[PDB]
Protein backbone atom coordinates (compact mmCIF):
# COMPACT_ATOMS: atom_id res chain seq x y z
CA UNK A 1 0.00 0.00 0.00
CA UNK A 2 1.04 3.28 -1.00
CA UNK A 3 -0.19 7.08 -0.19
CA UNK A 4 -1.50 9.45 -2.76
CA UNK A 5 -1.42 13.19 -1.61
CA UNK A 6 -2.86 15.65 -2.79
CA UNK A 7 -1.64 19.76 -2.97
CA UNK A 8 -3.08 20.84 -0.05
CA UNK A 9 -1.98 17.86 2.02
CA UNK A 10 -2.89 14.17 2.42
CA UNK A 11 -6.75 13.85 2.84
CA UNK A 12 -7.79 16.13 0.30
CA UNK A 13 -10.21 18.83 1.50
CA UNK A 14 -11.09 20.41 -1.36
CA UNK A 15 -14.48 19.14 -1.00
CA UNK A 16 -15.04 19.28 2.30
CA UNK A 17 -18.66 21.10 3.80
CA UNK A 18 -17.85 22.69 6.82
CA UNK A 19 -18.77 21.24 10.47
CA UNK A 20 -21.04 23.69 12.95
CA UNK A 21 -18.80 22.58 15.78
CA UNK A 22 -15.51 21.28 14.38
CA UNK A 23 -12.43 22.58 11.92
CA UNK A 24 -10.01 21.06 10.36
CA UNK A 25 -6.61 22.28 11.31
CA UNK A 26 -4.30 19.74 9.04
CA UNK A 27 -3.98 15.88 7.83
CA UNK A 28 -0.98 13.89 8.00
CA UNK A 29 -0.34 10.37 5.94
CA UNK A 30 2.09 7.48 7.58
CA UNK A 31 2.98 4.50 5.24
CA UNK A 32 4.10 1.84 8.16
CA UNK A 33 5.61 -1.57 8.01
CA UNK A 34 4.68 -3.63 11.21
CA UNK A 35 5.35 -6.89 12.12
CA UNK A 36 2.38 -8.80 13.78
CA UNK A 37 2.43 -11.94 16.02
CA UNK A 38 -0.02 -14.12 13.50
CA UNK A 39 2.05 -13.83 10.16
CA UNK A 40 5.38 -13.54 9.76
CA UNK A 41 6.00 -11.50 7.18
CA UNK A 42 5.58 -7.25 7.40
CA UNK A 43 2.41 -5.80 6.92
CA UNK A 44 2.20 -2.10 4.82
CA UNK A 45 -0.08 0.24 6.41
CA UNK A 46 -1.46 3.48 6.02
CA UNK A 47 -2.29 5.91 9.00
CA UNK A 48 -4.27 8.71 7.74
CA UNK A 49 -4.25 11.43 10.96
CA UNK A 50 -6.91 14.14 10.90
CA UNK A 51 -6.44 17.06 13.25
CA UNK A 52 -9.80 18.33 14.18
CA UNK A 53 -10.34 21.60 16.63
CA UNK A 54 -13.26 22.10 18.59
CA UNK A 55 -15.41 25.75 17.88
CA UNK A 56 -16.00 26.87 22.15
CA UNK A 57 -18.43 29.35 20.90
CA UNK A 58 -21.67 27.46 22.17
CA UNK A 59 -20.05 25.67 25.62
CA UNK A 60 -18.92 28.96 27.10
CA UNK A 61 -22.21 30.65 25.81
CA UNK A 62 -24.52 28.37 27.42
CA UNK A 63 -22.29 27.06 29.97
CA UNK A 64 -19.43 29.03 31.41
CA UNK A 65 -21.45 32.29 31.40
CA UNK A 66 -24.43 31.74 32.93
CA UNK A 67 -22.84 29.54 35.48
CA UNK A 68 -20.25 32.67 36.33
CA UNK A 69 -23.36 35.11 36.48
CA UNK A 70 -25.45 32.83 38.83
CA UNK A 71 -21.94 32.59 41.24
CA UNK A 72 -21.26 36.21 41.18
CA UNK A 73 -25.17 37.07 42.27
CA UNK A 74 -25.00 34.34 45.10
CA UNK A 75 -21.74 35.55 46.17
CA UNK A 76 -23.43 39.25 46.41
CA UNK A 77 -26.38 37.81 47.96
CA UNK A 78 -24.20 35.28 50.57
CA UNK A 79 -21.96 39.21 52.01
CA UNK A 80 -24.64 42.41 51.76
CA UNK A 81 -27.23 43.17 54.28
CA UNK A 82 -30.03 45.53 54.80
CA UNK A 83 -28.15 47.33 57.66
CA UNK A 84 -25.66 46.55 60.65
CA UNK A 85 -27.06 46.62 63.99
CA UNK A 86 -29.85 44.25 62.90
CA UNK A 87 -29.77 40.14 63.22
CA UNK A 88 -29.11 39.01 60.05
CA UNK A 89 -30.72 36.24 58.40
CA UNK A 90 -29.31 32.59 57.53
CA UNK A 91 -28.21 32.51 53.75
CA UNK A 92 -28.03 28.89 54.03
CA UNK A 93 -31.13 28.79 51.19
CA UNK A 94 -29.51 30.89 48.53
CA UNK A 95 -26.65 28.58 49.16
CA UNK A 96 -28.85 25.44 48.61
CA UNK A 97 -30.75 27.22 45.31
CA UNK A 98 -27.50 28.02 43.79
CA UNK A 99 -26.12 24.54 43.75
CA UNK A 100 -29.11 22.90 42.40
CA UNK A 101 -28.61 25.62 39.88
CA UNK A 102 -25.28 24.60 39.28
CA UNK A 103 -26.20 21.28 39.50
CA UNK A 104 -28.74 21.65 36.57
CA UNK A 105 -25.63 23.04 34.58
CA UNK A 106 -23.66 20.37 35.20
CA UNK A 107 -26.29 18.35 34.42
CA UNK A 108 -26.14 19.51 30.94
CA UNK A 109 -22.90 19.41 30.46
CA UNK A 110 -22.32 16.00 31.15
CA UNK A 111 -24.80 15.26 27.94
CA UNK A 112 -21.88 16.83 25.65
CA UNK A 113 -19.19 15.23 27.45
CA UNK A 114 -18.39 11.56 28.16
CA UNK A 115 -17.38 9.57 31.55
CA UNK A 116 -13.80 10.83 31.43
CA UNK A 117 -11.91 9.23 34.45
CA UNK A 118 -8.29 10.05 33.71
CA UNK A 119 -8.35 13.02 33.50
CA UNK A 120 -9.98 16.40 35.18
CA UNK A 121 -11.51 18.58 31.95
CA UNK A 122 -11.47 22.36 31.90
CA UNK A 123 -15.23 22.71 32.18
CA UNK A 124 -15.42 20.40 35.07
CA UNK A 125 -12.82 22.51 37.24
CA UNK A 126 -14.63 25.38 36.45
CA UNK A 127 -17.63 23.90 38.22
CA UNK A 128 -15.47 22.61 40.76
CA UNK A 129 -14.04 26.08 41.85
CA UNK A 130 -17.97 27.55 41.46
CA UNK A 131 -19.12 25.08 43.77
CA UNK A 132 -16.52 25.15 46.26
CA UNK A 133 -16.74 29.38 46.07
CA UNK A 134 -20.27 29.14 47.03
CA UNK A 135 -19.68 26.18 49.71
CA UNK A 136 -16.95 28.51 51.52
CA UNK A 137 -19.22 31.78 50.99
CA UNK A 138 -22.68 29.75 52.58
CA UNK A 139 -20.02 29.25 55.26
CA UNK A 140 -18.55 32.21 55.69
CA UNK A 141 -22.08 33.96 56.10
CA UNK A 142 -22.86 31.40 59.11
CA UNK A 143 -19.22 32.49 60.50
CA UNK A 144 -20.68 36.42 60.25
CA UNK A 145 -24.01 35.41 61.97
CA UNK A 146 -21.42 33.79 64.51
CA UNK A 147 -19.18 36.48 65.14
CA UNK A 148 -23.01 38.61 65.46
CA UNK A 149 -24.24 35.93 68.03
CA UNK A 150 -20.94 36.53 69.84
CA UNK A 151 -22.21 40.34 71.15
CA UNK A 152 -24.80 38.99 73.12
CA UNK A 153 -23.10 37.14 75.66
CA UNK A 154 -21.70 39.91 77.37
CA UNK A 155 -18.21 40.30 77.24
CA UNK A 156 -16.90 43.16 75.18
CA UNK A 157 -14.22 42.45 71.90
CA UNK A 158 -10.97 42.38 72.83
CA UNK A 159 -8.46 45.78 72.49
CA UNK A 160 -6.46 44.18 69.62
CA UNK A 161 -9.94 42.92 67.92
CA UNK A 162 -11.63 46.57 67.86
CA UNK A 163 -8.27 48.30 66.63
CA UNK A 164 -7.62 46.04 63.77
CA UNK A 165 -11.86 46.49 63.12
CA UNK A 166 -11.38 50.11 63.37
CA UNK A 167 -8.14 50.15 61.01
CA UNK A 168 -9.30 47.77 58.01
CA UNK A 169 -12.35 49.76 58.11
CA UNK A 170 -11.08 52.56 55.78
CA UNK A 171 -9.66 50.23 53.69
CA UNK A 172 -12.92 48.34 52.63
CA UNK A 173 -15.49 50.79 51.70
CA UNK A 174 -17.32 50.85 55.17
CA UNK A 175 -17.96 53.23 57.55
CA UNK A 176 -19.43 53.46 61.26
CA UNK A 177 -22.79 54.04 62.20
CA UNK A 178 -24.12 56.82 63.76
CA UNK A 179 -25.48 55.05 66.56
CA UNK A 180 -22.35 53.50 67.48
CA UNK A 181 -20.41 56.74 67.35
CA UNK A 182 -23.72 58.09 69.17
CA UNK A 183 -22.75 55.19 72.58
CA UNK A 184 -18.98 55.95 71.75
CA UNK A 185 -19.23 59.60 72.92
CA UNK A 186 -21.87 59.14 75.54
CA UNK B 1 -34.57 60.16 61.60
CA UNK B 2 -34.88 62.83 59.12
CA UNK B 3 -31.50 61.42 57.29
CA UNK B 4 -32.73 58.27 57.07
CA UNK B 5 -36.22 59.65 55.78
CA UNK B 6 -34.26 61.64 53.26
CA UNK B 7 -32.05 58.80 52.03
CA UNK B 8 -35.54 56.40 51.83
CA UNK B 9 -36.90 58.99 49.57
CA UNK B 10 -33.77 58.93 47.19
CA UNK B 11 -34.28 55.22 47.31
CA UNK B 12 -37.63 54.98 46.38
CA UNK B 13 -37.38 57.28 43.73
CA UNK B 14 -34.27 55.12 42.42
CA UNK B 15 -36.35 52.17 42.53
CA UNK B 16 -39.08 54.02 40.36
CA UNK B 17 -36.52 54.94 37.44
CA UNK B 18 -34.98 51.18 37.88
CA UNK B 19 -38.52 50.25 37.81
CA UNK B 20 -39.25 52.37 34.52
CA UNK B 21 -36.09 51.73 32.78
CA UNK B 22 -35.76 47.92 32.67
CA UNK B 23 -39.90 47.49 32.29
CA UNK B 24 -38.69 50.05 28.75
CA UNK B 25 -35.85 47.89 27.53
CA UNK B 26 -37.22 44.71 28.38
CA UNK B 27 -40.31 45.92 25.84
CA UNK B 28 -38.17 46.55 23.74
CA UNK B 29 -35.51 43.79 23.79
CA UNK B 30 -38.52 41.38 23.80
CA UNK B 31 -41.02 42.47 21.08
CA UNK B 32 -37.80 44.31 18.56
CA UNK B 33 -35.80 41.37 17.80
CA UNK B 34 -39.18 39.21 17.86
CA UNK B 35 -40.39 41.36 15.21
CA UNK B 36 -37.44 41.42 13.81
CA UNK B 37 -37.47 37.94 12.83
CA UNK B 38 -40.91 38.14 12.09
CA UNK B 39 -39.93 40.80 9.75
CA UNK B 40 -37.29 38.20 7.61
CA UNK B 41 -39.89 35.40 7.94
CA UNK B 42 -42.25 37.43 6.13
CA UNK B 43 -40.53 38.91 3.45
CA UNK B 44 -38.61 35.80 2.17
CA UNK B 45 -42.02 33.97 2.36
CA UNK B 46 -43.93 36.47 0.47
CA UNK B 47 -41.18 38.15 -2.23
CA UNK B 48 -39.31 34.71 -2.86
CA UNK C 1 -40.25 29.19 24.55
CA UNK C 2 -40.62 32.97 23.76
CA UNK C 3 -43.93 33.60 25.47
CA UNK C 4 -43.08 31.91 28.64
CA UNK C 5 -39.86 33.39 29.30
CA UNK C 6 -41.19 36.77 28.66
CA UNK C 7 -43.20 36.76 30.73
CA UNK C 8 -40.96 35.30 33.91
CA UNK C 9 -38.73 38.11 33.18
CA UNK C 10 -41.67 41.24 33.47
CA UNK C 11 -43.05 39.50 36.57
CA UNK C 12 -39.24 39.75 38.29
CA UNK C 13 -38.24 42.71 37.08
CA UNK C 14 -41.80 43.88 38.92
CA UNK C 15 -40.62 42.17 41.68
CA UNK C 16 -37.43 43.50 41.96
CA UNK C 17 -38.13 47.39 41.76
CA UNK C 18 -41.63 46.93 43.64
CA UNK C 19 -41.48 47.69 47.96
CA UNK C 20 -44.34 47.58 49.78
CA UNK C 21 -43.64 50.50 51.82
CA UNK C 22 -41.28 53.42 51.58
CA UNK C 23 -39.74 53.68 54.78
CA UNK C 24 -38.92 50.45 55.77
CA UNK C 25 -35.85 48.55 54.84
CA UNK C 26 -36.38 46.70 51.83
CA UNK C 27 -35.00 43.05 51.62
CA UNK C 28 -32.88 41.21 49.45
CA UNK C 29 -34.29 40.16 45.66
CA UNK C 30 -31.34 38.12 44.72
CA UNK C 31 -32.77 34.72 45.68
CA UNK C 32 -35.71 36.38 43.47
CA UNK C 33 -32.91 36.66 40.79
CA UNK C 34 -31.45 33.30 41.27
CA UNK C 35 -35.13 31.49 41.10
CA UNK C 36 -35.92 33.38 37.82
CA UNK C 37 -32.33 32.18 36.28
CA UNK C 38 -32.95 28.40 36.94
CA UNK C 39 -36.33 29.26 35.64
CA UNK C 40 -34.77 30.20 32.36
CA UNK C 41 -32.18 27.52 32.51
CA UNK C 42 -34.46 25.27 32.42
CA UNK C 43 -35.98 26.87 29.72
CA UNK C 44 -33.41 27.51 27.66
CA UNK C 45 -32.51 23.66 28.39
CA UNK C 46 -36.01 22.72 26.76
CA UNK C 47 -34.34 25.19 23.59
CA UNK C 48 -30.97 23.19 23.06
CA UNK C 49 -33.24 19.92 21.95
CA UNK C 50 -34.45 21.44 19.10
CA UNK C 51 -31.08 23.03 17.88
CA UNK C 52 -27.88 21.85 17.12
CA UNK C 53 -24.11 23.07 18.60
CA UNK C 54 -24.30 25.61 16.69
CA UNK C 55 -20.93 27.81 17.39
CA UNK C 56 -20.49 29.74 14.12
CA UNK C 57 -23.51 32.32 14.57
CA UNK C 58 -25.82 33.48 17.70
CA UNK C 59 -29.37 32.53 16.98
CA UNK C 60 -32.04 34.77 17.18
CA UNK C 61 -33.36 32.86 19.98
CA UNK C 62 -29.91 32.73 21.90
CA UNK C 63 -29.47 36.63 21.52
CA UNK C 64 -33.06 36.63 23.05
CA UNK C 65 -32.52 34.42 25.83
CA UNK C 66 -29.49 36.42 26.77
CA UNK C 67 -31.20 39.67 26.72
CA UNK C 68 -33.10 38.72 29.16
CA UNK C 69 -30.55 37.12 31.77
CA UNK C 70 -28.60 40.48 31.57
CA UNK C 71 -31.88 42.24 32.15
CA UNK C 72 -32.70 39.68 34.99
CA UNK C 73 -28.85 39.77 36.10
CA UNK C 74 -28.33 43.40 36.55
CA UNK C 75 -31.82 43.97 37.88
CA UNK C 76 -30.52 41.97 40.87
CA UNK C 77 -27.53 44.32 41.25
CA UNK C 78 -29.64 47.22 40.63
CA UNK C 79 -32.27 45.63 43.33
CA UNK C 80 -29.28 45.68 46.02
CA UNK C 81 -28.14 49.31 44.52
CA UNK C 82 -31.15 50.61 46.36
CA UNK C 83 -30.36 49.26 49.68
CA UNK C 84 -27.58 50.76 49.62
CA UNK C 85 -28.47 53.75 48.98
CA UNK C 86 -31.43 53.23 51.93
CA UNK C 87 -28.04 51.89 54.10
CA UNK C 88 -26.45 56.01 53.93
CA UNK C 89 -29.29 56.81 56.08
CA UNK C 90 -28.25 55.02 58.73
CA UNK C 91 -24.50 56.32 58.65
CA UNK C 92 -25.32 59.67 59.84
CA UNK C 93 -24.64 62.67 57.18
CA UNK C 94 -27.54 63.80 54.98
CA UNK C 95 -27.88 63.84 51.19
CA UNK C 96 -26.61 66.55 49.20
CA UNK C 97 -28.04 69.76 47.94
CA UNK C 98 -28.26 68.86 44.24
CA UNK C 99 -29.42 64.94 45.17
CA UNK C 100 -32.31 66.19 47.07
CA UNK C 101 -33.26 68.92 44.40
CA UNK C 102 -33.03 66.43 41.39
CA UNK C 103 -34.64 63.41 43.86
CA UNK C 104 -37.84 65.95 44.47
CA UNK C 105 -38.02 66.91 40.56
CA UNK C 106 -37.70 63.67 39.14
CA UNK C 107 -40.04 62.61 41.73
CA UNK C 108 -43.53 64.29 40.23
CA UNK C 109 -42.20 62.43 36.66
CA UNK C 110 -41.98 58.65 37.80
CA UNK C 111 -45.63 58.14 39.51
CA UNK C 112 -44.05 58.43 42.77
CA UNK C 113 -45.49 60.78 45.51
CA UNK C 114 -43.69 61.66 48.87
CA UNK C 115 -45.36 60.18 51.86
CA UNK C 116 -47.38 61.84 54.66
CA UNK C 117 -44.28 61.05 57.49
CA UNK C 118 -41.63 62.93 55.18
CA UNK C 119 -43.82 65.97 55.09
CA UNK C 120 -44.37 66.03 58.67
CA UNK C 121 -40.77 65.69 59.02
CA UNK C 122 -40.28 68.62 56.72
CA UNK C 123 -43.28 70.62 57.84
CA UNK C 124 -41.52 70.16 62.20
C1 LIG D 1 9.74 -5.46 8.72
O1 LIG D 1 9.40 -4.24 9.37
C2 LIG D 1 10.35 -3.82 10.35
C3 LIG D 1 9.78 -2.58 11.00
O2 LIG D 1 8.79 -2.91 11.97
C4 LIG D 1 11.71 -3.58 9.70
O3 LIG D 1 12.67 -3.27 10.70
C5 LIG D 1 13.16 -1.92 10.56
O4 LIG D 1 13.87 -1.70 9.34
C6 LIG D 1 14.36 -0.36 9.19
C7 LIG D 1 14.96 -0.26 7.81
O5 LIG D 1 16.05 -1.16 7.66
C8 LIG D 1 15.35 -0.03 10.30
O6 LIG D 1 15.77 1.32 10.17
C9 LIG D 1 14.70 -0.24 11.67
O7 LIG D 1 15.67 -0.08 12.70
C10 LIG D 1 14.09 -1.64 11.76
N1 LIG D 1 13.47 -1.89 13.06
C11 LIG D 1 12.40 -1.28 13.62
C12 LIG D 1 11.72 -0.18 12.85
O8 LIG D 1 12.00 -1.61 14.73
C13 LIG D 1 12.15 -4.83 8.95
O9 LIG D 1 13.35 -4.56 8.22
C14 LIG D 1 11.07 -5.30 7.99
N2 LIG D 1 11.45 -6.55 7.35
C15 LIG D 1 12.03 -6.61 6.15
C16 LIG D 1 12.36 -7.98 5.64
O10 LIG D 1 12.28 -5.60 5.49
Given at each position: ??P????????????????????????????????????????????Y????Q????????????????????????????????????????????????????????????????????????????????????????????????????????????????????????????????????? | ???????????????????????????????????Y????????????
Amino acid sequence: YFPRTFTNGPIGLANFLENDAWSVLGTKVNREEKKYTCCPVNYTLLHYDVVIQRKPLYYVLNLIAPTAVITFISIIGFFTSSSVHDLRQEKITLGITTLLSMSIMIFMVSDKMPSTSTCVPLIALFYTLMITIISVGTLAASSVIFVQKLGSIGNPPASKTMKWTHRIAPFVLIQMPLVMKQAYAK
Amino acid sequence: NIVELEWDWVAAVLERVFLIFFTICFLFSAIGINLYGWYIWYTENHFL
